[PDB]
């Protein structure tokens, strides 16, 4: 019962719960992002903290599945912007409020902690935040 182990479990459940429980999470969160405005491959890599290449994989699958449509900027031809299609919009929404609920779960969970206890939680989830880069 080192906290190290507790951490490794926590993450393991996060992965194994997602897995088991057709679109990737990447795909789901791309749709979610493009739900509130259109964006480049590059905004999206930035926003979601992933490779350009990973967006372009997901993007292409989405386009194959009629989810998404690329339409080029009329000042800079290099740039393409993606909109959702009608088929996607129900899907984006559904995922959007799946995420609204998980925030309540997070809120309720955090309520168990004094607001000074929480500054450690904040600190902790913050260093944990991007020690996940490697």
Contacting residues toward Zn ion, per CB under 5 A:
28
97 is in an annotated binding site: no
Among 74, 75, 76, 132, binds a second copy (CB under 8 A): 132
CA–CA dist 89, 32 (Å, integer): 9
Chain Cα centroid distance, residue 64: 21
- Listing DSSP states for 122-134 in one string gives HHHHHHHHTTTT-
Footprint of a second copy on residues 58-97 (CB under 8 A)?
none
13 near a second copy (CB under 8 A): yes
Complex with a second copy: residue 72 or 123, whichever CB lies closer = 123
Q: How far is CA 29 from CA 34, 50, 60, 94, 127, in A?
A: 8, 12, 15, 11, 23
47 interacts with a second copy by CB under 8 A: no
Nearer to a second copy, 29 or 88 (CB): 29
Binding-site residue ranges for Zn(2+): 29, 95, 99
């Amino acid at each position: 019962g080192t906290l190290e182990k507790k951490l490794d479990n926590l993450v393991n459940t996060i992965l194994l719960k997602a897995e088991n429980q057709k679109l990737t999470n990447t795909q789901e969160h791309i749709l979610m992002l493009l739900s509130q405005q259109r964006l480049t491959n590059t905004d999206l890599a930035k926003a979601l903290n992933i490779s350009q290449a990973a967006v372009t994989k997901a993007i292409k699958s989405l386009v194959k599945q009629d989810m998404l449509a690329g339409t080029k900027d009329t000042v800079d031809a290099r740039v393409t912007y993606f909109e959702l299609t009608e088929l996607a919009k129900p899907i984006a929404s559904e995922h959007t409020h799946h995420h609204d609920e998980t925030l309540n779960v997070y809120n309720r969970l955090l309520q168990k902690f004094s607001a000074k206890e929480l500054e450690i939680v904040d600190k902790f989830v913050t260093v944990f935040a991007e020690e996940l880069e490697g």
